[PDB]
Amino acid sequence: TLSFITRWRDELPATYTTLSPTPLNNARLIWHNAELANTLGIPSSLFKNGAGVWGGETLLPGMSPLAQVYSGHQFGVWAGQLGDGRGILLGEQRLADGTTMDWHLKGAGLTPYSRMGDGRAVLRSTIRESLASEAMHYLGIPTTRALSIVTSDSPVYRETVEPGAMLMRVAPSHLRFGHFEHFYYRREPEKVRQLADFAIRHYWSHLADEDKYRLWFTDVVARTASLIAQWQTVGFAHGVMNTDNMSLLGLTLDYGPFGFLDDYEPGFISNHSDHQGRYSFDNQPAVALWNLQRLAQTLSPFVAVDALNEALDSYQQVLLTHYGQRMRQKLGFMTEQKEDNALLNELFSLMARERSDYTRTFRMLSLTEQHSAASPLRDEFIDRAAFDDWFARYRGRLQQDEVSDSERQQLMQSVNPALVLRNWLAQRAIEAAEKGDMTELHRLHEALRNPFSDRDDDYVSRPPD
Ligand SMILES: [Mg+2]
16 A cells, blocks of 8 residues: 655665664554554554564565765854764655655664764654654644654663664655755765756656746745744744755754743753854744855856845745734734834733743733733733733734724634643653653643644643743
8 A cells, every 4th residue: 555666766876875774672663643644544554563664673665765965064064974864764655646755764773874873863852853843733834744653672872871762754855955065065066956956856846847946946945934934933943953954845854952932032042052042043034044045055056146146035025924924913913014013022022021931922812802901911921010001002903903802813813822842741741751651642742733722731831940
């Protein structure tokens, strides 16, 4: 029932190494994405009889596993050759609708690109990635998806000793900006052009059959700008916005030291190793443009310097358009005024002063009735005078929309999540998981499928501090 093709292997030779996964000791499934497997046509047969393909212990017919090579700038510095060091592309699944999905197995063992590591993933990494990628998907933000998590008795040495794990990642492509950078700086511009032709052929098929490259790169800019805009509106900090972590398709790619904002803190740094705050939450719009600028440099051998700078200059416009329009929904501004950003900056500066909870503030603000000063937010601000002064002037704008309380409260409640993957919720699932209890991991996953539905439990509370 499952059909795999070898498109990367046969159409981009010398961009990978063929190899097989190396299993772990007594690997067992601890979670799988039943909804996603149904989307992909995977029989529940495959999730029973042992770890199977999800443990790197079997290959399905058509799979030809390989580890891709790439490079990239890490923290603004050319890090040289990187590549698939902790994962293996098992193959590319062809779906009945004609589309293709990568099956990338994190922690499948050593590769030529494993660098100083061991090629292994640990249980906490796999669970945090599965929780965050799924949370992002149900928030509507493009992302890789998690299909399965396998744990084992193989110990891996990091800060502690951790159980080796493996996660099956699904995405339409794992093309990164660093794929292009890798062959540019090796002075192989024809392999840069082959990557572009490959990417347009299979993922921008409507173009490329006369200015195909300008149109394509312009859309890559738009899709990255649109992605960063969505990160900002929900309060997601990636943590490692290196050029090898930037998806060419515009997906949230690689989940490591990420963090959804608990306290509103514009300069929040989620990566403990990000000493200079390069990937701080407020720096993400600027860092993405810099990453797009690295990518355009690799395309210069075959796309005019004129068109590249034009597509690069559209980044600010596409970002602010997407950001402004979504922030307007989060604020309930059913119409548009030149004004609306000043109210938002007011609210943002008060929140940063009080360290208010980002998600809860916007969720409570969605209970707003334009003609009443009453609000559950009055108890959440120490400076109640400041909030009351912002609220009636803010409600002053709402009354200019000429729209029902019922109509505005419905729109806001469909864009302001009641629920985000907070760090402590993941840690609680992790701790239970490490002791053999997966009921918390399954429960949190279930909640993150309905993030716009209000709850009575601690999944919507502020962290315990
Ligand atoms: Mg990475």
